[PDB]
Amino acid sequence: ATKAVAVLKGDGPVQGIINFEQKESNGPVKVWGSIKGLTEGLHGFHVHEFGDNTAGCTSAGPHFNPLSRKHGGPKDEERHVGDLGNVTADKDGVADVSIEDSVISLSGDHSIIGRTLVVHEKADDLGKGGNEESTKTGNAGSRLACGVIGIAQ
């Protein structure tokens, strides 16, 4: 509901703290997250999980979560069942959070806590993904930056 904590640990150091306050009453989620990462950009936050492992999400790879924004658009439309924002890392791995007007976006449709985020300093696009299947699923680097995300309160 009111706050969330994200904890990511990868092969490359990726660390950030994303906190999102949503409620089923419908309202823009006030969310803040900073990411530190290897040198790259980042575009789109498209998480899609039902919980796997905070060291790398196997389920988060090729699994589309349609409840999100139907495809998972970054601004959200319904219940982006993943973290919603746009973040762009610099060469020093530092991404400022774009806080978008979301509707019911708690990161996860089956639940939130335990759900592993798939983002990285990379375009983790929503509806475009990358290649046809990744377009469908909405890009995921299963272990590129993954950790259990969830509303921690």
Name the residues that contact Cu ion, by CB under 5 A: 46, 118, 124, 139-140
Nearest to 6 by CA among 69, 39, 49, 68: 49
**Catalytic residue of the set 43, 69, 80, 115:** 80
| 43 assigned binding-site residue | no
- Minimum Å gap between C-beta 34 and Cu ion is 18
Reported in sequence order, the residue ranges of the chain that DSSP labels E, i.e. its strands, are 5-6, 15-21, 30-36, 86-89, 94-98, 115-116, 148-150
110 in active site: no
Output 26 or 80, the one with its CB closest to Cu ion: 80
- Minimum Å gap between C-beta 93 and Cu ion is 17
- Minimum Å gap between C-beta 25 and Cu ion is 27
Place of tokens 């983002």: 119
143 in active site: yes
**Catalytic residue of the set 43, 69, 79, 143:** 143
| 110 assigned binding-site residue | no
71 in active site: yes
| 71 assigned binding-site residue | yes
The rounded distance, in Å, linking the Cα atoms of 21 and 134 is: 28
Is 39 buried (19+), middle (13-18) or exposed (0-12) by CB count in 10 A?
exposed
As annotated, the active-site residues are 46, 48, 63, 71, 80, 83, 120, 143
